Copies of this chain bind each other. A is one copy, B any other.
Amino acid sequence: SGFRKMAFPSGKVEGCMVQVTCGTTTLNGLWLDDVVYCPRHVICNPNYEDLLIRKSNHNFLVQAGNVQLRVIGHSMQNCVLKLKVDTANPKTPKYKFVRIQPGQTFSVLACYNGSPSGVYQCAMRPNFTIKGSFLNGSCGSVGFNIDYDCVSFCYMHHMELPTGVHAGTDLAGNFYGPFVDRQTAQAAGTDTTITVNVLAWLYAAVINGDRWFLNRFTTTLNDFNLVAMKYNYEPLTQDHVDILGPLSAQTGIAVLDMCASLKELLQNGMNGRTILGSALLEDEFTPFDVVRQCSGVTFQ
């Protein structure tokens, strides 16, 4: 048993972490096939189409270890710079590009100068920020999910908001949330808490022995939601109750039942106890995260 915040095996992604240098700006890139993907503010309220015609393929240093790659061409898809090189990546895995919805989770391989520093487990907060760990140097690092064999890149780093959270893009260049790669005032927007994720982790608690927080009480989907707002949680949909079923099936606790217990964790807190070793209601676990860890789905 057990239950940890658990990242995907980073092997297939590490092989794709390369160094991109230009002027006095060095950030990370993602070399899949013969393309290297990196955040565009490496060519630096700038005008990036302005700045990309000024540069030539030879202005873009691309180290892949002690193996400098030659750029043969470049292009700017939204906020990503796509550097064609003269060399397919031998380590390119089966991969996808995907854009996640708020609530979903992914693993961040965190690089500096093209070298992997660490891997950890984020979700995409409701306000399209992520609570990350990114120092100066970390740009061009990717979030991702692994689907049997296929890596689904869903996030590139770019910038940090003034409160300590992090902003970024799908690998299609487009930013999650209103954020934009210029040094201007821009705010996250108030973060709610992901409700279907809090329930799931509670089913993870039940699958693991913490039952202290149950009760016979049922509630309606609505009367729960009248209490979810007051506590800054997503209103819960029936479509969430649907995904929560399998866990509800394996534990026998009706989703409406566990809602009524979450209701009670909200109105009385927790009185100095823990669920799964936390004194907070953890929303960074999706219902699938739970079923994967609490059932042992691997990746080949």
Contact = CB atoms under 8 A, between A and B. Distances in A.
B278 A132 contact: no
A120 B1 contact: no
Interface residues of A, number: 57
A115 B299 CA distance: 6
A297 B120 CA distance: 15
A231 interface: no
A113 B278 contact: no
Given A115-B298, A116-B299, A138-B296, A5 B2 contact: no
Contacts of A137: 296
Interface stretch (A9-17, A36-44, A48-56, A254-262): A9-17
Interface in A220-273: 269, 272
22 contacts: A2-B131, A2-B134, A4-B120, A6-B117, A6-B119, A7-B120, A9-B116, A9-B118, A10-B10, A10-B119, A65-B300, A112-B298, A116-B298, A117-B297, A117-B299, A118-B293, A135-B294, A135-B295, A138-B296, A269-B272, A278-B279, A278-B280
Contact of A280 (B115, B136, B274): B274
B11 A166 contact: no
Given A278-B279, A278-B280, A296-B135, A119 B2 contact: no
B164 A116 contact: no
Interface string A84-113: 000000000000000000000000011111
Nearest to A111: B298
Given A6-B110, A118-B293, A209 B298 contact: no
Contacts of A138: 296
A7 B132 CA distance: 13
Interface in A159-210: 160, 164-166, 208-209
A3 interface: yes
A8 interface: yes
A299 B11 CA distance: 13
